[PDB]
Design a protein around this nucleic acid. Structure first.
Lengths: 116, 177, 43, 50, 75, 136
RNA sequence: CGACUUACCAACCCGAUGCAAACUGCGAAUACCGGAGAAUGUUAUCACGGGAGACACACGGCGGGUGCUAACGUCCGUC
RNA sequence: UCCUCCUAAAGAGUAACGGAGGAGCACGAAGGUUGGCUAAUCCUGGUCGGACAUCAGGAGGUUAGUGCAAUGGCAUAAGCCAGCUUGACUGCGAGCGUGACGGCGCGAGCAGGUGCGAAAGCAGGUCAUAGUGAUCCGGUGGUUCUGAAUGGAAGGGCCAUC
RNA sequence: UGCCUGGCGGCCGUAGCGCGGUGGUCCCACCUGACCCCAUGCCGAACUCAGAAGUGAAACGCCGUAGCGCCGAUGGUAGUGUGGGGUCUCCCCAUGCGAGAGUAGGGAACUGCCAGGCAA
């Protein structure tokens, strides 16, 4: 199962970040509408979220679910986090290879202020 | 690829009408084919493995991989991690052209032909069979090879049972004698 | 698809004795001559 | 105890050396690990010797 | 042909639930991991559990496998 | 001569016979022999009792044995000093607690059943009583 | 190349019955460790210093190994 | 002498010429990190091939495996595969466990300089528990520390090691 | 506020399996192609990129069903600390603690944060 394999892949990282006790930037990727979220160390609340599923961010990019979409979401999370106040975060692959859209989102985020 | 268009042209409709499914994807469809060659005699002479792999590359469109023994058994004098066979799995588009070569030029050239078997089903919808000699495929000139070893074929589809798998194969004008 | 590890997969036209001609991509080589095919055979 | 002990001598002029073990029957070639030399406080190549 | 034995390794729980410990103190000595490290608890190379912070030690059961965990709360 | 096959260990500790019997009810036949006393039965005693009943019933009905030795017992050879290791295994015994059902039987009249069990109990070292299958 | 029966041998499983110091999908009483509290006890506690003796133990109860669930036998745990 | 289980009486420890077995290693990778993967046993179809080679599907969920006997542990895998590598590093070390002692074990963290990863991070050998021998005497390399009138040297000391 | 959907958790079998039904407005999945990014110890299988035709088949979510797993009393029983007694290799009395298995029964979940669509 794709989901079961993915959860098994990301379990070690999630546990490592959980015991470390640090805010983590978690990204969920699908064939469309790449998501992104910021989670408190306790893991119970979401500091801020962004994605291409809402019209506020989906009204510019031609198509959601590409490199451009990842950069927009990656950038979008940036100023939101900077405005909120949190600066340092830990990136979570969530079992997605850090190659394409995931890398583009992270690259946009780190260059936008969320260094990690 | 030509039969893939043929499959997409009316065979899907033929499957649709006969089983009157609710949807279109319910019809069984082939996803991959697998070629096996359990040589077994690697112990006597491991050098022949390379050429045994070579001919499979002649029939197939890609390089085979050599499989290793799952475990060591004293009854066969084989140790764990020792190559004792090769296989090939082909899917996507290349499977279709190979399926042509099997169904058009290979089956007719069977020595002492009697008819393709129809009871060779695993019980879930997957078909398997074997061949005596390589010359059935055109890629053997009878002078560059001097071995009688055969090979095994196996086509797997998304059928939930044998009845639709047999019906789907029948749509491909299989002998089934 | 890996490079420079697979045999050449060029197209080639093959015809049999009963007048049926078809194009197939394989590793047969330069030319091919057949006598029977799917049809025109006592199967 | 076929495994026997060797000495790894730093490529630098310093006389510092490490001591380890190896099997000459299986791996007869020399050992060229890159280790830390505290006399010069740098990582340098260490060569096998008696 | 018997008569051989090994010196006892004095394993077991060294600090029990609800008693304060200093950082670096050994809590449990074990061969495997009968208890898994929790919060402010580190695991040694020999699966020894030691306190990484000063506080009260507590035991609990967590996870889908109901495996036992040792934590420390700064109290 | 009941005896296990390829037991895990040749020797085992003496242990104790405290406690109370578990198989205290008739489960297979219609009549049974219940153990009143506490002790151990050797394999030879079980065989002797079994032969006594089979002859008594004249191979009519069914016989069930509800006890197995599965416990080796050692014994030092004569003129051997104490020590020098555990003794060699000699015979196998079954520990019996009060209420244990030793033998069960079915397919014979109650009258003939009583004498058959009485003959068997005469060749056992523990007080026994006759019981009948109960309804639930 | 189809295929069939069985008065006869029997695997794996299902239902019932047991056994285990070196079996545990369960699990006490006590004991042990830590914290708070009252009373009681000639500080009964700990650390340091001076001086020792002792390191052949025995029986009884309880939990055992060994022996024959023999020994005023032998070897351990606790009083 | 050392290691594992039981005896051992639910903390630790606990004897017998009591009941069972092992060790005097191995590995420059079988170590470090990054990425990925998940067995045994059965059922059906299939050339040699046959109960037991390899292929496909299904039940199964770890009865597999874990370099070496046993116990405990291991899916975040400690199990299996591949890339890059030498942290199997130097000086320390709060605080603990264990011993009559000699001693043995665990260890966050700090400084220096490294490897893997985009990064958070991990790495002071190996899933852990056996694979080991005090002191004396002497050998090898470094270090003006000393060097018995002075300058050297011999010989000692210190450090690494046999 | 409600029916829904996705992510991150709490909690961990009353939460897990089996059978039947139900879902495409969004979301999710399958799905087309892959010259380029990326990968196959062979394979667009898996991973990754460019897409959205088609579809709810499979998977996933929800509902129903006890057919299993699971939870589970009260009472009794076993064992047991302390103090006594006996026909003492085992038991009994006073007091304290009190199982395991089984039985009646329960049971096919609950809950926090964020984001999106519909109706409000």
């Amino acid at each position: 199962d794709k989901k079961s394999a993915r959860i098994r892949r990301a379990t070690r990282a999630r546990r490592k970040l959980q015991e470390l006790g640090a805010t983590r930037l978690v990204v969920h990727r699908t064939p469309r509408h790449i998501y992104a979220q910021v989670i408190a160390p306790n893991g119970s609340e979401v500091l801020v979220a962004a994605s291409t599923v809402e019209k506020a961010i989906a009204e510019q990019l031609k198509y959601t679910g590409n490199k451009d979409a990842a950069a927009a979401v990656g950038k979008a999370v940036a100023e939101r986090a900077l405005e909120k106040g949190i600066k340092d975060v830990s990136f979570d692959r969530s079992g997605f290879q850090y190659h394409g859209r995931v890398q583009a989102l992270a690259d946009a985020a780190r260059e936008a202020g969320l260094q990690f | 690829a030509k039969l893939h268009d043929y499959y997409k042209d009316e065979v899907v409709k033929k499957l649709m009408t006969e089983f009157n499914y609710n949807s279109v994807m319910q019809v069984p469809r082939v996803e991959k084919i697998t070629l096996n060659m359990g040589v077994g005699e690697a112990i006597a002479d491991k050098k022949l493995l390379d050429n045994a792999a070579a001919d499979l590359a002649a029939i197939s469109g890609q390089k085979p991989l050599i499989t290793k023994a799952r475990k060591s058994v004293a009854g066969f004098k084989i140790r764990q991690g020792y190559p004792i066979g090769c296989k090939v799995t082909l899917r996507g588009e290349r499977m279709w052209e190979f399926f042509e070569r099997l169904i058009t030029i290979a089956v007719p050239r069977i020595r002492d032909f009697r008819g393709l078997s129809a009871k060779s089903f695993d019980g879930r919808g997957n078909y398997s069979m074997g061949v005596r000699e390589q010359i059935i495929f055109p890629e053997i000139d009878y002078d560059k090879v001097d071995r009688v070893r055969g090979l095994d074929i196996t086509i797997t589809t998304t059928a939930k049972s044998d009845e639709e798998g047999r019906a789907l194969l029948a749509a491909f004008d299989f002998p089934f004698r | 698809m890996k490079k420079d590890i697979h045999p050449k997969y060029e197209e080639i036209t093959a015809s049999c004795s009963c007048g049926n001609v078809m194009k197939i991509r394989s590793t047969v080589g330069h030319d091919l001559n057949l006598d029977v095919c799917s049809k025109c055979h006592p199967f | 105890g076929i495994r026997e002990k060797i000495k790894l001598v730093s490529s630098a002029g310093t006389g510092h050396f490490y001591t380890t073990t190896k099997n000459k029957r299986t791996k007869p070639e020399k050992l060229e690990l890159k280790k830390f030399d505290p006399v010069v406080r740098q990582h340098v190549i260490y060569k096998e010797a008696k | 042909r018997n008569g051989r034995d090994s010196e006892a390794k004095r394993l077991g729980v060294k600090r029990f639930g609800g008693e304060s410990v200093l950082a670096g103190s050994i809590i449990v000595r074990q061969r495997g991991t009968k208890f898994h490290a929790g919060a402010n608890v580190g695991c040694g190379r020999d699966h020894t559990l030691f306190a990484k912070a000063d506080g009260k030690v507590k035991f609990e059961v967590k996870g889908p496998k109901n495996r036992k965990f040792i934590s420390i709360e700064a109290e | 001569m009941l005896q296990p096959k390829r037991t895990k260990f040749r020797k085992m500790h003496k242990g104790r016979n405290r406690g109370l019997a578990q198989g205290t009810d008739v489960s297979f036949g219609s009549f049974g022999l219940k153990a009143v006393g506490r002790g151990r039965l050797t394999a030879r005693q079980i065989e002797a009792a079994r032969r006594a009943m089979t002859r008594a019933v004249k191979r009519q009905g069914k016989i069930w044995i509800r006890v197995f030795p599965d416990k080796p017992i050692t014994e030092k050879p004569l003129a051997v000093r104490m020590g020098k290791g555990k003794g060699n295994v000699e015979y196998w015994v079954a520990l019996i607690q009060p209420g244990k059902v030793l033998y069960e039987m079915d397919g014979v009249p109650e009258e003939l059943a009583r004498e058959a069990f009485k003959l068997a109990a005469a060749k056992l070292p523990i007080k026994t009583t006759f019981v009948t299958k109960t309804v639930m």
